[PDB]
Amino acid sequence: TREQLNLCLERLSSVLQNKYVRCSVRAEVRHLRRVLCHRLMLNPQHVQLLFDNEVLPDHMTMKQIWLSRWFGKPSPLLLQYSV
Amino acid sequence: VFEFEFSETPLLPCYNIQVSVAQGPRNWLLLSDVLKKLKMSSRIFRCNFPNVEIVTIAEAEFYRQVSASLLFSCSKDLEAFNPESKELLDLVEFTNEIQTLLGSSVEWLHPSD
């Protein structure tokens, strides 16, 4: 298989449940947004993903976010979501 | 199709390690990490999962493959290991069954909702 990486999701200013997420390195922001919608039982496009209070583009992969903002930081990668 | 693991408990590190040339790199957990979380004996684990692959690997070799990875660029994610060690480590193959046993739920995202 392909590399897996570990995320921890945090609500910022209806909550999650299981905030630790493992996914494929190729998983993209858009995919995570939809999977989160499913778990929170929301319509599509009601969850945006953020790092350091800025919205992440739909086409960015989890691996990019790691290398660009989390390089040399301890696992898991910390992301936030808004509803 | 994309596979996601959700857990309200921190995740064990997943290691991408080639054990056989024929197989290429595969995903594994350190068995001691699994056994610690469950406080379970090696014996009970192997009895209950007789067909989950466990392999032994030199800690030295383990260190080289793991440090090669950009995702293990933090010193903290490697400090439990010794680059020159001749000790053998046990790796358990990282299956959905193991993820489930360790308390997580596995979800599948398809092109549609």
The domains found in chain A, sorted by start residue, are 1-83 (3.10.20.90)
Phi, psi of B49 (to 5 degrees): -130, 65
Contact A40, A16 (CB under 8 A): yes
Q: The tokens of A75 are what?
A: 């696992």
Q: Which CATH superfamily is domain B1-113 in?
A: BCL-6 corepressor, PCGF1 binding domain (3.10.260.40)
Phi, psi of B8 (to 5 degrees): -95, 10
**B29 in A contact zone (CB under 8 Å):** no
Q: Cβ B71–A17 below 8 Å, yes or no?
A: no
Q: Dihedral of CA B91/B7/A60/A54: which sign? A: negative
What resolution, expressed in A, was reported for this entry? 2.0
Percent composition of chain B: helix, strand, coil (DSSP 3-state, to 5): 30, 30, 40
E strand or H helix at A59, and its extent?
Answer: none
Contact A56, A36 (CB under 8 A): no
**By CA distance, what is B16's nearest residue in A?**
A3
Among B40, B14, B68, residue whose Cα is nearest residue A4: B14
**A20 in B contact zone (CB under 8 Å):** yes
Contact B82, B62 (CB under 8 A): no
Q: Among all chains, which residue has been given the structure tokens 């945006």?
A: A48
Out of A25, A31, A72, closest to residue B73 by CB: A72
- For residue B27, list chain A residues with Cβ-Cβ distance below 8 A: 1, 3-4
